[PDB]
Amino acid sequence: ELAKPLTLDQLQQQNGKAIDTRPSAFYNGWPQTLNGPSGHELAALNLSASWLDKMSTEQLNAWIKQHNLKTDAPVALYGNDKDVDAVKTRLQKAGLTHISILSDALSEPSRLQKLPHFEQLVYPQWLHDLQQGKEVTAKPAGDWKVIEAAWGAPKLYLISHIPGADYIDTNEVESEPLWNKVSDEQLKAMLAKHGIRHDTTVILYGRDVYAAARVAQIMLYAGVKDVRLLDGGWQTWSDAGLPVERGTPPKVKAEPDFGVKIPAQPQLMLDMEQARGLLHRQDASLVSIRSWPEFIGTTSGYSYIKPKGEIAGARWGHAGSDSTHMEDFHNPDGTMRSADDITAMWKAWNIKPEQQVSFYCGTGWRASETFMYARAMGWKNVSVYDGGWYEWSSDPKNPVATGERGP
């Protein structure tokens, strides 16, 4: 059973921590109802009851230690009753000894904290409701498109996809020889074919978030003003049990006139020499979003990239276990991890919002995901260095760092 309830001020006086047991969408800032409260209590941690069946004892234990919860320091939970009880039970089994309810949680909307642009990382019920013609928070200001992105021709999309979702093949936005973005003229044709003007809202999802992210960032470069991602991609829609549609992509009405000159935001993409110029500075960071084996030089990550090693002077931004995973940015349900947590992860390696920051990996997909998360987090000067390791290392004169090493 729960300890004595605590108000936030009592919690602060007793040096405790608040834990928001709601899904991350609500933690991030999505209101649970129209004009409803937006965000989480100050310095709150997010442990969503919905993640518990995907977190082992080890995983929860690591999470407790990584957030500096002391066994006997008060923790005050909030959210719905059932989610609060589920969290309480696991935390008790993990050995926390002072678990209470935060009795005034969410009662003062003006004191809550949120992702500066949480509305860029959407969630399934929002998108269903949008589709159904309901009023939603942060509604698209005008026309909108929902689009699944994956490599190659539609595969899983044919079996199942989000109702009314188009499909983009990532090969429409990037190509040989270097898996850099196709030309400004080719993006113009791709935008037109997918019914996208600069003032069209685009919501992108993939089986893998980074596929969506990559399309997304390249559309932001071109000039689509309002581009967003389904947070956690397809598996969140699947998990929610919402309706699906099947079969080939339906006809989309083309938009032959984009309505501004492409690229409207060239600064969001950096070339080799721009990337080079960030290195060895405190006011900028060129950031490797590659697995640690990539980063130290054990492997290149890619069957088609012979060289091994890292851009010398690049700072490690974390990423995932191999070249096609992104665990270091995901919660157990595949959604973006807490901004406070990403922020501390990057700060430990001297990566900070006040710097000019550019992310890269082997060819750009993982860097695109981190780009979109930093955008949602309010980071004002971020980009992707497209060519990345494949480009960097294709010239033997570029400097390469190797081996285990710290900040």
Swiss-Prot record:
<keyword id="KW-0677">Repeat</keyword>
<keyword id="KW-0574">Periplasm</keyword>
<feature type="domain" description="Rhodanese 2">
    <location>
        <begin position="140"/>
        <end position="246"/>
    </location>
</feature>
<protein>
    <recommendedName>
        <fullName>Thiosulfate sulfurtransferase YnjE</fullName>
        <ecNumber>2.8.1.1</ecNumber>
    </recommendedName>
</protein>
<dbReference type="Pfam" id="PF00581">
    <property type="entry name" value="Rhodanese"/>
</dbReference>
<dbReference type="GO" id="GO:0042597">
    <property type="term" value="C:periplasmic space"/>
</dbReference>
<feature type="domain" description="Rhodanese 1">
    <location>
        <begin position="12"/>
        <end position="114"/>
    </location>
</feature>
<feature type="binding site">
    <location>
        <position position="366"/>
    </location>
    <ligand>
        <name>substrate</name>
    </ligand>
</feature>
<comment type="subunit">
    <text>Monomer.</text>
</comment>
<keyword id="KW-0808">Transferase</keyword>
<feature type="active site" description="Cysteine persulfide intermediate">
    <location>
        <position position="361"/>
    </location>
</feature>
<dbReference type="InterPro" id="IPR001307">
    <property type="entry name" value="Thiosulphate_STrfase_CS"/>
</dbReference>
<dbReference type="InterPro" id="IPR036873">
    <property type="entry name" value="Rhodanese-like_dom_sf"/>
</dbReference>
<dbReference type="GO" id="GO:0016783">
    <property type="term" value="F:sulfurtransferase activity"/>
</dbReference>
<keyword id="KW-0732">Signal</keyword>
<dbReference type="InterPro" id="IPR045078">
    <property type="entry name" value="TST/MPST-like"/>
</dbReference>
<feature type="domain" description="Rhodanese 3">
    <location>
        <begin position="280"/>
        <end position="401"/>
    </location>
</feature>
<dbReference type="GO" id="GO:0004792">
    <property type="term" value="F:thiosulfate-cyanide sulfurtransferase activity"/>
</dbReference>
<dbReference type="InterPro" id="IPR001763">
    <property type="entry name" value="Rhodanese-like_dom"/>
</dbReference>
